[PDB]
Design a protein around this ligand. Structure first.
Ligand code: HEM
Ligand SMILES: CCOC(=O)c1cc2cc(-c3ccncc3)ccc2n1CCN1CCOCC1
Length: 411
């Protein structure tokens, strides 16, 4: 049929778009008129990839099919981040293959099995009481300030305290850990143009290898002991593997959950009836609707290892496919009234945590618990908060970020 009604040269990974808005109408146009669509990229404008473009994947069922078929659609070949600075060196993309996220089987399979010791339901549930205490304090301290930046005073700290608590990081080191974590993303935004994620990664790995050495000497009530201890078949994280895991956690669990909190509260501000129902019932289904609505990871990519026919479209070996979770989470064929914010939506088969498959977010339930604890604390301590001014968005081609949002906690 006809081509989609998009501006000439539109690129759905363009950071200049996301600094201003989510391209919600453009995604809906692809879903209607071209659900799998070749997004061409001009020479030098591919965000670190130099292959002419990629396939835009806009439907939830296609996102799931790609995610299940990891034997064909590789994470390792080009990594899963679909946009960097246009001048990034290929070596700086390939160095990212040392984190589990950018590995294929069998290397990913081994690493995932070991790391799963650190994300058992018991390990995550063991954080519930401390994270609930920290959430209440964060909301109380924010409310006491009267007004301020909701992103910084409500959204930022609890995700970072969740990473620190999972890892057993001493309190005197958590300032350093949070700094390194915050220096890992956003470097295409002018506000963060001076951050040095390579230097931060190196500092994190060095810190993490020292922690691995020390925690072998004395096991503690952390997951670190379970990670670096050989099983019957001698499987464990080496010290440097633990380091690359910490680098991966510092990124994976920080600005993702943060942006679900900020955009969850933005949704509540825009849907007062849902906020009144939340305060009354406190339904934990709200966390999944908040993740669906916030879709903190706009997109991850894969690379075809062989020719593959997807929904009538011939994907060719070597081509990239970009899974736009932000489109799939509003797919009219899957969700009843996708553009209604409904905190009771159940079941909620969103792909905010990815499509079901080998790389499905291992921190999904830790993320949901963090969200539920902070929004209970917000409801307890600042039930009448009202926005002061519009959110400032993050210039990124794959992360859907809010840098700042002024709020009157008093109302
Ligand atoms: C709302 C918050 C979060 C969102 C939206 C999110 C989203 C995602 C997505 C989209 C993926 C890729 C899934 C795929 O490719 O199929 C992923 C993977 C991953 N996430 Fe999360 N995540 C969140 C929170 C967290 C937290 C809190 C942690 C840990 C503290 C975490 C750890 C990981 C790890 C380790 C992976 C890699 C898994 C693998 O490659 O096998 N995430 N996440
Ligand atoms: C060798 C250092 O490992 C990285 O670098 C790295 C890890 C990482 C993890 C995620 C991630 C996001 C969401 N869920 C799970 C994982 C995303 C990006 C990641 N990176 C790349 C950092 N980049 C920043 C700027 O440019 C250099 C690369």
């Amino acid at each position: 049929g006809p081509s989609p009604n998009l501006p000439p040269g539109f690129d759905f990974t363009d950071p200049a778009i996301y600094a201003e808005r989510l391209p919600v109408a453009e995604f809906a146009e692809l879903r209607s008129a071209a659900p799998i669509w070749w997004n061409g990229q001009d020479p030098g404008k591919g965000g670190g990839f130099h292959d002419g473009g990629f396939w835009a994947i806009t439907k939830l069922n296609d996102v799931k099919e790609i995610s299940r078929h990891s034997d064909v659609f590789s994470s390792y070949e080009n990594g899963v981040i679909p946009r960097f600075k246009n001048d990034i060196a290929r070596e700086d993309i390939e160095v990212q293959r040392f984190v589990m996220l950018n590995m294929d089987a069998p290397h990913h399979t081994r690493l995932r099995k070991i790391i799963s010791r650190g994300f058992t339901p018991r390990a995550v549930g063991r954080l519930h009481d401390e994270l609930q205490e920290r959430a209440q304090k964060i909301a109380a301290e924010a409310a006491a300030a009267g007004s301020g930046d909701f992103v910084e005073q409500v959204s930022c700290e609890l995700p970072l305290q969740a990473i620190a608590g999972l890892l057993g990081v001493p309190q005197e080191d958590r300032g350093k850990l949070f700094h390194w974590s915050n220096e890992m993303t956003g470097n295409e935004d002018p506000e963060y143009a001076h951050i040095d994620p390579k230097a931060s990664s190196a500092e994190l790995i060095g810190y993490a290898m020292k922690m691995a050495e020390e925690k072998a000497k004395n096991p503690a009530d952390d997951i670190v002991t379970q990670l670096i201890q050989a099983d019957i078949d001698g499987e464990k994280l080496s010290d440097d593997e633990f380091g690359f895991f910490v680098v991966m956690l510092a990124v994976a669990g920080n600005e993702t959950t943060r942006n679900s909190i900020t955009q969850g509260m933005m949704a509540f501000a825009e849907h007062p009836d849902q906020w009144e129902l939340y305060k009354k019932v406190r339904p934990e289904t709200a966390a999944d609707e908040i993740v669906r609505w916030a879709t903190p990871v706009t997109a991850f990519q894969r690379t075809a290892l062989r020719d593959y026919e997807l929904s009538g479209v011939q994907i060719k070996k070597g081509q990239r496919v970009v899974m736009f979770y932000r489109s799939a989470n509003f797919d009219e064929e899957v969700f009843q009234d996708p553009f209604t914010f409904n905190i009771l939506r159940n079941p909620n088969p969103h792909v905010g945590f990815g499509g079901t498959g080998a790389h499905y977010c291992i921190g999904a339930n830790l993320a949901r618990m963090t969200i539920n604890l902070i929004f209970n604390a917000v409801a307890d301590h600042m039930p009448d908060l009202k926005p002061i001014s519009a959110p400032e968005r993050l210039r990124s081609g794959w992360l859907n970020g809010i840098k700042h949002w002024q709020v009157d906690y008093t109302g």
